[PDB]
Design a protein around this ligand. Structure first.
Ligand SMILES: O=c1[nH]cc(I)c(=O)[nH]1
Ligand SMILES: O=c1[nH]cc(I)c(=O)[nH]1
Lengths: 446, 446
């Protein structure tokens, strides 16, 4: 029974396959209570799991629901990428459609926000009518039509993970190697993918700031994934500063769109082309990293990524007209069709100097307490709330120049909140420089 | 917010008084979700709390509800006793009315089962009509007409403890010195007592088997109690074997009534007189402890605690006729008036030998899975389920002599169930001896 299983883990003992499957079944069928879920999640977070338990949690979460079947004509076309989570990380919003443009099939099952990081599903929900929950049947139609699709956990698609994911988010049990591994792979295993690239963040606002832990996760994701029959590669990418300039939901959707019609900040386009190019390589569609990167980049310039993105929006519930407007509209028009915070508050530079860095963690934490993230499961988010980096890293600015614009619904920023933000603006006084790219290294399966 | 409070404790940090009161209010008002209550509890169970946190929790729980207001004329009479939970530990049932058999006012706020231990509130419920939820007003009337009462936590009395109590029970977070401490003391502080005696168990079926760990609890209980302006004494008693010969709920009420009949097992009576003795002394209604143990014992026969029990039962919802029935009724009559298990299964001595011990834990565990224990929240119990020790410790026996009577409602005992219970009977080659007395020592407040 639940109390005993929890007790074993609490004592630092391992769970047998039956126990794990037992636990997962109880979660899915609703017999497990919230406290028991939270208790077990914490026991794991604090005591851990070995690679066998871990692999078992994965198979279990994966099997708690359906297995996605596709036309065998799609077999080698099926690919996906997943990010462990970060700030301003709307890569998936761009990659999904940019791949489906290269003929690739992407049945992406992602998630909502986790802790201080943003979830792509919450970002898509900024778009009116976008429905994250799609059946396995609709998903097939989606791939047939736009060859794109970004859905979330549901009754049919990894329900066990859906429930745990939402509990982890608000029980301080996000940063657990085995829970992240099972959660991520279970989603991807159910997809029947040919290749998969997981973007494992490291740095300031990463689940695992510590680069060495980012690595351990990277190697584990790939190892367990391999052992479970999935061609997987992991990319370790910086998340010390936000990706792009926009952080939030509604705001990140417009930057994603800016990226899709050939523009946007270089770091964003870089990560998109490097992971996509790494993904095309992994799946055999591209000969080398550079070739695959170029094809994806071409999709960003082509207008075909944006086009696939448009079909996806319409096929997942967005009114065709709004879909055509988001993709056909200019930055300002998109900004108007998407949720908007009630107040705009710009932060000014405290001095002259170079933007050495903009701490992503402090920024996400404040964005978090302003309604961008959850502190309770099922809690509505204030889509619209977010932030815009008005200055890039590597550029020089003077005191008095606005470097950040906070989009908020509530009161003017609190005291400790303002301090935290300014605190995030690191300045040095040297010549301007070229900001480095997020991507660090690729970890392949043994 | 909740997620952060949990992370702090999760990481080993202590919670500020504002944090704990913050968390407690969230538990009482609903903002804290099940998974969050469980996460917090497990974090605390694994990273502990310090004396101040513990002290602060205790206050918060006590203050989560109402403070019981009594007529000044009683102030000096209001006493109570508590247990850390055990097996067959029906002492409060016998001791509460026994005390009220000496003018003392006992507004006992106890609780339900906790882990593998039986709760007196569950025991009282096997008594048709008995209500455990009495508002403060009813509690005054009860003491006024019967001198005692046994109620449970409610929206009005320690709401916060009620919630943590029910969750800890099914989350393997019962055995936490600080949680037990705040839980026990919070209920007592709200009672406005002038002396509290806690029976801290140690032994095979104790929350804290290790006698030294139990002593740490006993010290904390008295220490923190003292710091909160409550005269508290704590006894340390054995729980390697079951207190009495009857384990369960309806069955525990019968053996209890037998004790209030001036009969029963030495086990029970001995413990009820000792702790009661310590109580009357502690509160000043007795010059010494032996005199108290004497007045209490007298009440078992003369002065009538059985008489006080009847008035309590009636005053707490039990039909007056049934109440008198249970009192004047003899064992056989008592059984017919209470819930009886559907069937009866007896175990036979696996071999000749002297009964060195009847391991309480294995007993509780099995009775537990037959419906005597909870596995979820308010999961209903099978109150007639239990066991009768058909043999005493110290005696010898021959293979074939039934040593245990199991009262179950479902299927006959299973293989692993029978094996578990058999392994509970420890036969030694020694000569017949007299079973020792539960009581070990008494820790005091100065
Ligand atoms: O699906 C997931 N993405 C990111 C993380 I971190 C996780 O645990 N699961
Ligand atoms: O009221 C209580 N009795 C026994 C235990 I153990 C506890 O934690 N609380």
């Amino acid at each position: 029974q639940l109390p005993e299983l929890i007790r074993m883990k609490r004592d630092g003992g391992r769970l047998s396959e039956a126990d794990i499957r037992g636990f997962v079944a109880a979660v899915v069928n609703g017999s497990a209570q919230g406290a028991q879920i939270g208790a077990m999640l914490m026991a794991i977070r604090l005591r851990g799991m070995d690679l066998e338990e871990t692999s078992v949690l994965t198979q279990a979460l994966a099997q708690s629901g359906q297995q996605l079947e596709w036309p065998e004509a799609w077999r080698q076309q099926l690919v996906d990428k997943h990010s462990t989570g970060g700030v301003g990380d709307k890569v998936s919003l761009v990659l999904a459609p940019a791949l489906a443009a290269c003929g690739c099939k992407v049945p992406m099952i992602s998630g909502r926000g986790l802790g201080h990081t943003g979830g792509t599903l919450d970002k898509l929900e900024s778009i009116p009518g976008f429905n994250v929950i799609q059946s396995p049947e609709q998903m097939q139609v989606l791939l047939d039509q736009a060859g794109c699709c970004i859905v979330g956990q549901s009754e049919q698609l990894v329900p066990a993970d859906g429930i745990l994911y939402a509990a982890r988010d608000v029980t301080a049990t996000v940063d657990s190697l085995p829970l992240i591994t099972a959660s991520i792979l279970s989603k991807k295993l159910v997809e029947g993918l040919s290749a998969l690239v997981v973007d494992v963040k490291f740095g300031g606002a990463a689940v695992f700031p510590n680069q060495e832990q980012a690595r351990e996760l990277a190697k584990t994701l790939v190892g367990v994934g391999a052992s479970l029959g999935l061609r997987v590669a992991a990319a370790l990418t910086a998340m010390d500063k936000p990706l792009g300039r926009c952080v939030g939901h509604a705001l990140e959707v417009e930057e994603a769109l800016l990226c899709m019609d050939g523009a946007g900040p270089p770091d964003l386009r870089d990560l998109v082309t490097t992971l996509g190019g790494a993904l095309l390589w992994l799946s055999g569609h591209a000969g080398t990293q550079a070739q695959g990167a170029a094809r994806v980049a071409a999709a960003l310039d082509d207008g075909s990524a944006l086009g696939r993105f448009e079909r996806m929006l319409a096929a997942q519930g967005v009114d065709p007209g709004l879909a055509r407007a988001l993709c056909s509209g200019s930055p300002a028009e998109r900004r108007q069709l998407l949720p908007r915070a009630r107040e705009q508050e710009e932060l000014l530079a405290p001095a002259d100097g170079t933007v050495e860095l903009v701490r992503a963690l402090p920024l996400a934490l404040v964005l978090h307490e302003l309604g961008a993230g959850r502190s309770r499961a099922g809690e509505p988010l204030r889509l619209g709330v977010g932030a815009e980096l008005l200055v890039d890293v590597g550029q020089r600015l003077r005191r008095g120049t606005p470097w950040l614009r906070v989009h908020r619904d509530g009161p003017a920023l609190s005291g400790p909140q303002s301090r935290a933000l300014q605190e995030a603006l690191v300045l040095s006084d040297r010549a301007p420089f070229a900001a480095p790219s997020p991507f660090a290294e690729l970890v392949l399966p043994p």
